[PDB]
Symmetry: D2
Subunit: 317 residues, 4 copies
C-alpha cells in the first residue's frame, strides 16, 4: 500500500499517542522542503531573466517561516544566522530545530547536488527559551534527517522507529515512501573525502586511505567518490555503503563541518540505520556542544568501515 510522509508521520504519531506537535513541525518542514526544491530546480527562472519585461537566503527564509508558523518550535538554529532565533511567545512550541537550509550551495553555480539538513530536540526546561537550549548532545535528538536535491528530491527521515526515505513526486507535490526502515550495508567499497588536503592529514587518516588503495588482505581497492556536498556524499554512503570522512586538517583543526546541523543529524541517521559516526575520539552524538556553530570532525558510514578506521586511529593513539 502506498504511503506518504505526512500520513506515515501521522500514523506513527497516533500509534505513540503524541500530542501532534512533532507531526505539525515535520509537515511544516516538508512544505518548506518542497518550496526549496522548486526554487533549486529553477522553476520560474524565466521571470528573473525578463520573460515579462539569494537561494540560500530564500531557503533559510522558507524553513524559518514555516517552523515559526508551525507553533511547534521555540529555538531555531541555522547555518545562516549568527545567533539562535527565539520564536515569539504566541507561536512557541516545545521543539528546538538546528538546520542547514541549503548545504553545499557555495558551489550551486555548477549545479552540484545540494540539500537541507535538520535535527530536532525537545526543550527540556521551563526556563524562557534561549540559545543554550540548542546546546544538547546529538544523543538527545528526537528526529533528524535531510532532503537531497539531487537528480531527484528525496527526504530521509530518522526517528526512533528507524530511517525512512521518501521521494518527492513533483507531479503531485507529495513525498512518497519508497524505502522503509533502511539499514546501511555492514561494509562498503567506496571512501569519500577531499584528498586535496593530503599534506595536512593526520597520520591515521593517511594510513587508512592507504589501506583503501592498497588493501592488506588482498581484497579489491575501494573506489573513491567525493561530490563535495555533504548531503550528496552522505546519502550515497547510506545507499551504497562505505565511508565518508571530513577529518581535521591544517585549515580546520576541529574539522570543518558544523556539529549542530551537519554532523549530529547525519550521525543520528547513520546510527538509526545501523551505521556509525565518530570524531575519532568519541561518537559524534556524544559530543557536548558549547557553541551553536562549533565544528567537529566526522567519519561515518558502514560499521565495518568506521570500525576499521577506528582501529587505525587507535593505533596512532
Amino acid at each position: 500500500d502506498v504511503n506518504t510522509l505526512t500520513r506515515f508521520v501521522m500514523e506513527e504519531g497516533r500509534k505513540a499517542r503524541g500530542t501532534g506537535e512533532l507531526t505539525q513541525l515535520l509537515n511544516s518542514l516538508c512544505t518548506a522542503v518542497k518550496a526549496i526544491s522548486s526554487a533549486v530546480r529553477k522553476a520560474g527562472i524565466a521571470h528573473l531573466y525578463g520573460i515579462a519585461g539569494k537561494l540560500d537566503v530564500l531557503s533559510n527564509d522558507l524553513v524559518m517561516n514555516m517552523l515559526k508558523s508551525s507553533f511547534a518550535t521555540c529555538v531555531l538554529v541555522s547555518e545562516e544566522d549568527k545567533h539562535a532565533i527565539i520564536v515569539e511567545p504566541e507561536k512557541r512550541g516545545k521543539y528546538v530545530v538546528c538546520f542547514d537550509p541549503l548545504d553545499g550551495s557555495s558551489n550551486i553555480d555548477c549545479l552540484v547536488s545540494v540539500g537541507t539538513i535538520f535535527g530536532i530536540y525537545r526543550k527540556k526546561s521551563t526556563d524562557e527559551p534561549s540559545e543554550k537550549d540548542a546546546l544538547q548532545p546529538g544523543r538527545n535528538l528526537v528526529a533528524a534527517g535531510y532532503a537531497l536535491y539531487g537528480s531527484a528530491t528525496m527526504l530521509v527521515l530518522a526517528m526512533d522507529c528507524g530511517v525512512n526515505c521518501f521521494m518527492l513526486d513533483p507531479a503531485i507535490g507529495e513525498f512518497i515512501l519508497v524505502d522503509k526502515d533502511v539499514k546501511i550495508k555492514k561494509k562498503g567499497k567506496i571512501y569519500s573525502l577531499n584528498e586535496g588536503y593530503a599534506k595536512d592529514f593526520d597520520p591515521a587518516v593517511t594510513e587508512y586511505i592507504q589501506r583503501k588503495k592498497f588493501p592488506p588482505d588482498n581484497s579489491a581497492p575501494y573506489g573513491a567518490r567525493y561530490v563535495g556536498s555533504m548531503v550528496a556524499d552522505v546519502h550515497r554512503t547510506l545507499v551504497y555503503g562505505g565511508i565518508f570522512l571530513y577529518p581535521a586538517n591544517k585549515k580546520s583543526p576541529n574539522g570543518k563541518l558544523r556539529l549542530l546541523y551537519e554532523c549530529n543529524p547525519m550521525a543520528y541517521v547513520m546510527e538509526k540505520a545501523g551505521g556509525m559516526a565518530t570524531t575519532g575520539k568519541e561518537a559524534v552524538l556524544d559530543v557536548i556542544p558549547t557553541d551553536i556553530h562549533q565544528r567537529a570532525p566526522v567519519i561515518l558510514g558502514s560499521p565495518d568501515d568506521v570500525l576499521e578506521f577506528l582501529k587505525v586511529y587507535e593505533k596512532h593513539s
Copy 2:
C-alpha cells in the same frame, strides 16, 4: 532581451541562412531532454508505488532520444551507448545529420540520486553512400555541434557550436531552456583536480606524479582541492564553470581508457575546446582521434589549458 534555446537557434540559423534541419534536430533533442528531466526528477513515481491501486531510466531516455531524433527528419545514422550497432533511420525520415549520444550517462548509480546527464555529438554525413555505421566513424574535429544536458540540482543544457558555448537553464514551470551564460570560456588555470584516486595502484607513472604535484606542490603554492562525482557530465560541467582538470586516463590494465570516444569523450572535448580549454588522450587531441569502432574507448584529460599543459609536460617526461 530574454532568450530561449529555440529562439537562439532559429536566429543563428537565419543568420547563417541554413535550411532549418539542424534547428529541427536540436528542437527535437530539447524535447527529449525535457522528457528525460521530468522522469529523472521522478514525476509520476507515486503511480509506481500504488497511489491508484516501468522502464529503467536509461532505457526510457534512449527511447526518448531515439524517437525524437528519428521523427525530426534531420538524421540518418544514430549511435547510442545503448545499442551495439548504429541505428539507420528509415528512408522516409532521413535527414543529413549523424548523432552520437549517451542518453543517461551516470545512471548506473542513479539509485543514490547522483547527477546524471545526456551527452550528444552531431556530424554531417560526408559520403554519398547509403547511410551506414561508417558515417559515425568521424574524428571529433568534424563535429557540427555537441554538448550535454546535466540533470543536477537544476537541469541545464550546454550547447557548443562554431559560435561558441552557451548555457541554457531549463525552467520546469514553462518547459523552456533559458539562456543564462553566453559564449562561456573556461578559466586559464583552476584549483580542482578530478579523478578516481581509489585505483591509484593502477595509475600510469605520469598520472601518479601529476596528482602528487597537485597535493604536494613543489613551488609552495596551495594544494588543489579534489572533487570526483563519478558522473562524467557533473564532473565536466564543474570543470567548465570553476576551471581545473578532469582525468579518466589510460593505465596498464586499460590502455585505451574507459570512457567512450564517440559519445562521451568527443562531445566534451568539443565543448572544452570551444570554451578555450583542452582535451587530450595524453598522445593527441581527443578530437583528432580517428575512430574505427563506434564503441571504442579513449583516455581523456580535459579542462583549463594551463592544467592540461602541465599534465602533458609530466606525461612527456615519462615519455
Copy 3:
C-alpha cells in the same frame, strides 16, 4: 501567517481534541485530489501520444485507493460504482465517504471545468459495514466539499467551523488557504440552469426564470451562466451569489443529480456558507435516502433567491 489545508485541519483537530482519524482521511483525500488535478491537466500526455516510441476511472481509483489506505473509512460510495465498496477489515476506520470522483467529465473533451465532490459521514451503527451506512440524511454530514479543476485547482472544505477555500499551488503541491469562513451573498444576480429543456419545465420553474429575465418591477434582469458541470456552477454561485437549479419535472420527478455525492455535499457547503438548498418540497439535507444512487432535485444558492423560488414553487403547488 500562511496556512495550508493540512495545517488548518490539524489545528482544528487539536482544538476539538479528536483522535486524528478525520485528519488522516482528509490528508489522504487531498493527495488523491492532487493526483487527479495532475492527470486532468494532462501531465504526461506526451507519452500517450508516442514521445518515447479512462480519466474518470483513474480518478475513482485514486480516491478509492487513498481512502482505503487511510485506515479512516469503512464504506465507500462512488458515482462510478454500482454497489457500495466495503473496506477490508484490517483497514476499516469509522467514516463513510460518498463521492463523485470526476463530476462533469462526460464533456471533458471540450476541456470544460471538472471536479471531485465528497461528503463524509460517521458510521452510526456497530453492524457489519454495509451499503446502509451510507443511507444517512445530509444533516448527518461531518464534512463535505469539492475540488474544482478549473482555471486553477481549488479545494472547498465545509465543516462545523464553516467553509474554507484552499488554492492548490502546483509548484509545491500544497493547498493554500485563500478565503476563510466564506459566506454567500444574501441575494445574487445570476441564475444557472439548462434552459434548453424549457419545454419540460415545471410551470413554477418557467415562471421563476421568466421573472429573472423580465422583472415585474424596475430591477435589472439577472445574468445567465450554465457551465453544465455542477462543481463549476456551484462554485460560481458560492463566489458571486445567485441561484443554481436542477429541478424536478414531470419526466424527472426526482430531478437528475444524485443525492449522496452531488446534492448533499453541495447543500452542506451552501448551508455552512449561509445559503440554502431545497428540493422544492424540503431541504436537501433532510431527505432520508433509500438508494445510494437515488436522485434529488436541487435548487441552491443565495437565501433570498432560493426563498423567492420557493414562493413561486408553492404558488403552483
Copy 4:
C-alpha cells in the same frame, strides 16, 4: 509519430519555404502562453501568501507583449489591455501585426472559470511608418489566428491556411502536443450558447431563433443550452461538439459586446478554417472593415447548418 507545435510549424514553414519569421513569432507566442498557463494555474501562489515570511491580466499582457517584441517578428501590437496600439521600437521591428486578448474572461477568474488567450496575426500591408492603422485590417486578411484555453487542461488551437490543429500543453515537459489534426466542425450541432439574461433586449430574430431551439417546429429534440460566459471556453466547446454561439447586440451593447479585432475575428477565422461560419447578422465577421481597434461586433458562429438556420430567421425579419 508524435508531433509538437514547434515541430509542426517548422515543418509547415519549410514546406511553404517562408523566411521563418512567422515561426519565430509563433514560438515566442507559445512561450508566453506556457507562462500564462503556469500563472493561471497559481504555481507559486504560496509565496504571495507568505510562505517565506501583478494582477493576472496585467502579467499575461506583459508576457505576450514582451515575447512578441523580442521575437523581431512584429511591428504593431494591439491588446485588450492597452488603450492604444503599441508600436515596436525600430531595432526589433518585424513584418507582422498582432491583435490579442491576453487573458480573455479574467473578469470572473475569481470563480476559477476557464479563461484564455486569443490572437490574430496579420502581415503589415502599408509601407507607411507603423501605426495603429496597420491593425485595422478585415479578418479576411488574417495569416494565422487561434487561442489558448486554460480550462481543465491547457490547449492551443492554431488556425492557418493548412487548416485548424489542436495542441495539448503537457505541463510535465512544457510542450504542446498535437492531438487533433486538421479539425472540422460538425455540420450541425445540438447546443446553443448565449446569455439569455438579455432576453428582454433581444431583437426579434434572436428571440425566434432561440424559441426554435427550445420548441422545435419539426418536433425534433430541443437543443441543450451551455454558456460558460468566457468566450474561449464557449467557442472551443462549439468547435469540439458543434452547435452555435451567439453574442448579439443589446441595449447596453448596441454595437455588440465582443471585440472585433481580438475576439470576433480570430474566432471567426478558426471557425471558417474548420468549415464553420461566423456572421454579425448582416455580413461575415471577417468582412467587417474596422475603423477603431477596440470596436465591438455582434457575432453568431458555429456549425454551418446552425448559423444558416439563424440567418434564415434573420432574413425573415428583414
